[PDB]
Amino acid sequence: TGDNSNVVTMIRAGSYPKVNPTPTWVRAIPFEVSVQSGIAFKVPVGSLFSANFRTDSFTSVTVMSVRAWTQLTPPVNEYSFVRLKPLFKTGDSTEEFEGRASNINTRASVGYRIPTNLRQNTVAADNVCEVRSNCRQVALVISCCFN
Amino acid sequence: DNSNVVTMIRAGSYPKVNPTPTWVRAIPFEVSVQSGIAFKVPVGSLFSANFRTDSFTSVTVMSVRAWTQLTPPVNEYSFVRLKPLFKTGDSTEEFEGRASNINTRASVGYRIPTNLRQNTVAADNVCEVRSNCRQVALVISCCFN
Amino acid sequence: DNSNVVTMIRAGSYPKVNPTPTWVRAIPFEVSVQSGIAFKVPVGSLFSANFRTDSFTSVTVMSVRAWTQLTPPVNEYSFVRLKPLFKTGDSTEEFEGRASNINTRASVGYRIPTNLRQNTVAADNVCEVRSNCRQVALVISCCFN
Amino acid sequence: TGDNSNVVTMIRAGSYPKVNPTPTWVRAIPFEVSVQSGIAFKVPVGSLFSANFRTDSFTSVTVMSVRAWTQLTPPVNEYSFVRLKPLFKTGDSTEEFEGRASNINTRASVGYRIPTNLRQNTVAADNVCEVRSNCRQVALVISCCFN
Amino acid sequence: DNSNVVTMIRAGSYPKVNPTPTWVRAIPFEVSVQSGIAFKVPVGSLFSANFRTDSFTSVTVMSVRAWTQLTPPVNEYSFVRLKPLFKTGDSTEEFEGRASNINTRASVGYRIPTNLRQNTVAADNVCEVRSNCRQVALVISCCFN
Amino acid sequence: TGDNSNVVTMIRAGSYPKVNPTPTWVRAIPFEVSVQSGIAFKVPVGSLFSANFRTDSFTSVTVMSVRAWTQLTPPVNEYSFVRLKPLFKTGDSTEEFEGRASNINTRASVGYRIPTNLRQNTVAADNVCEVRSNCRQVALVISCCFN
Amino acid sequence: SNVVTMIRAGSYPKVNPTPTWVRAIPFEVSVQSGIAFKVPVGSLFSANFRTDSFTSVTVMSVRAWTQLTPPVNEYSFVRLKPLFKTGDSTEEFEGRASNINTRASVGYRIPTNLRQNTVAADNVCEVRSNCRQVALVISCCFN
RNA sequence: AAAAA
RNA sequence: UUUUUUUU
RNA sequence: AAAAAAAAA
RNA sequence: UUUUU
RNA sequence: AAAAA
RNA sequence: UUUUUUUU
RNA sequence: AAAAAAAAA
RNA sequence: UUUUU
RNA sequence: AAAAA
RNA sequence: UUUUUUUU
RNA sequence: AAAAAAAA
RNA sequence: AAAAAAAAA
RNA sequence: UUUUU
RNA sequence: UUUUU
């Protein structure tokens, strides 16, 4: 009910409201994972909790979607690619959502969305997905909900 | 999307990212107040791991609300005053709210105009607090950056 | 209410009160200016019992207007210049107004944008004033708090 | 004619306007008065003029309405009450606008409005109204016009 | 006015003039950045005869955009980070933009809100810059005054 | 696409745009020229380029219109007047746009507009117009385009 | 585009190397105290007005302004008595200034039938004033 | 969105 | 668009 | 059946 | 609606 | 845009 | 406008 | 078929 | 639309 | 506001 | 809504 | 002769 | 018959 | 919009 | 409408 103005204005507050000193937070976390040739890597959920993301105070998180980009150049004569295999505590998926680059100098991107019925919390000991690529590193952007 | 399995996302280029973004918050905390003496509420109280804000170093306050946290002296009704402070020049307003029931908290608050919403660091103060009660609860609405 | 007697007011709870509120004002005062020398108008001139503002210690200026208070030198028309000053960084504008009649005051003024309307204390200055006249009258629109 | 913007803008001022270094002020003054049992107290207008209200520069004021709240607890076994008898230099009123509390822990409130035909100036030597109450103190909020 | 000759102007009184007005500008310049070290971009870079702004002493920044000026290290894609700084309190945001092609610049930028658009002098800094490239080009939109 | 808000917001910038470190500037330059009795004075364009106008970095300018005001009192018993004769490198005009004051205490003003077909650049060695007046000084306000 | 084009002209048109010209001529005349000054039409034919090639002119209106200050304690005034070759008039169109520092202005319009040509020897109107140098602006048609 | 009047 | 020179 | 803010409904 | 820019 | 109810 | 004194 | 901003479409 | 004032 | 195509 | 498995 | 060719 | 500000109408 | 109709 | 974000 208050805007404009150039000086302080009195607020007619009432009863003490419902408060929460540690609220939730919807985020997209950008971090990188190194990857080997012909070998899959399980991305740990623990990478999401860090002071570099203002999330070191959380212990759980609900992932919503994962997106992966190749972070380094591919091998000689090759185009970049990156695969994603979703992992769940109730049962690992066998999908391999793959995306390849059409220009050797361009990143390779791919992503997958977690359905509502599978959006449960994950802790640092859990894994998000498996990453396969010919590039030595892969950049990730995970849309999740810390709680 | 009413679906029961993972579906592929056809991502394109790498987007603009930010690992340490801003945050609009309402921070609840308490301060001890002595009788007849004004207590300067420090900005550093907003930065704390108890509020997930220990990674921030500056904050832009939007409004300050106060509630008496303990019972008033005998035969008296609760009251609480707020005097906004600013690094460009402290104000002399004394926004006061009194309780109509001896068992009920006293409440008052003020809004900072847009032209006075600059950052404040831990060494700064937001306002002075006066009350006949020994503790005052505050719920400060601010934007951490 | 077209009534000729006192009528009862059915008051309820005690409302939020403020004994020392803010005040939007237009303060008229004069300053002495020497020829070829810029005079820094101090903010402390706004705080005075002559303006009912001796209880304030900070003020947020919105606009500054100036008028030459005395006659210009012989054969010359009056003029007056204003250079806004700010604690974050003084500006170099010289808003100038000249008189088209030797018997008429010269006038000019500037507006401070919203993003530059922060408090100023008595030790601060608002702007520099230049004129061929010995005195300049100012009517500063500000918000005392 | 000027708003928005991010820098100073030139104002094309004209003739020297009509000025007033000491303007009027409409206010609501909150102050307290102690009260005795079974004894009325005449509230002096002089309480309105003080540096605590930024009004020490005034010598006259035009009261518009008076509102009174009990400031301390009532006697044991009793509910709080407060009366108001308007006072005027042209003739004191005999009204006793009373308000009682329905909860022993709650304030008692009452007020009265001065009609336009009786809104003349009052100085420090004058009185506003008489206050009667069983509570040792009474809080007042007077809507007036200093001039 | 589709006319081919000079036409008379029926001027009246002398208008309000300003020989040193303000100026909204987009200043392009470059800075050298070392690997793993944040470079504080000084405000004094905006004041230069190369930008016709050597007559100004203060400036109000509105937005900052950055582009990597040189090629990234071998096997790496370009990136650039920006951390806005303010005299009232430095922020901790790290707005980052990465290039999807090793031969393409990385770009990112941030906007300063109205409540944080105060003047900055040459001794001040606008933001920190991090990048794997050795140089970063910036196009700062500001208002010289 | 960005306004309101109270904190910094990320801009999703793209390719490096087209830049210009030394852009043009439309200005109205106020400066004074002394004038003699019965003698014309050629106003040099070089007066427009100065650090007092933030224009010392320019070497050319396209004048659009000229306006002249008398700056000092006229001779005794006389009303003020001021004439303007436009000057052009392709051919000086013979017009004498004159304006006289109807009150001895009032300035005398006159101006002229340069047509689009004659709006070419002028350098410091060039002249704008000739000024004639009975007042010892004349004030000018030239609407031009520095480039 | 922004360059020349060709005009497909036809037969040689009707020409006139010395056409007419409507003008408003400003000039001043010296006036004595209590004496009426006859303004000669020849003052309109001058190289200072690009009119030294004309020998006749058709006057439409006359407007007068005092050019110098009035005597001490007096307000400026100026009178205009129209003159015509077919018969001098007796009107004294007078204008007075409500400010001692302000010019006194007056004028008169010539009707459309009394607008015949006048040569340099002819006079246009008498001028009276307490100021010494009344200025004139005459709207006329040179031919 | 010809010029003087 | 009151007139005159230029102007489809 | 014209643009706002500050104190008092 | 009062009143102060 | 009478007062008490 | 439920009523009573005042009130065109 | 009511007033905004911050992070995630 | 989610969610934090 | 099923999934692959 | 082009098709196939699931799906009133 | 009443549409097209080069530049915008 | 799309969102603003700065200097010049 | 230049050239050609 | 010119022009600078």
Ligand SMILES: [Mg+2]
């Ligand atoms: Mg790759």
Ligand SMILES: [Mg+2]
């Ligand atoms: Mg590509």
Ligand SMILES: [Mg+2]
């Ligand atoms: Mg009580």
Ligand SMILES: [Mg+2]
């Ligand atoms: Mg109660």
Ligand SMILES: [Mg+2]
């Ligand atoms: Mg003059």
Ligand SMILES: [Mg+2]
């Ligand atoms: Mg005048």
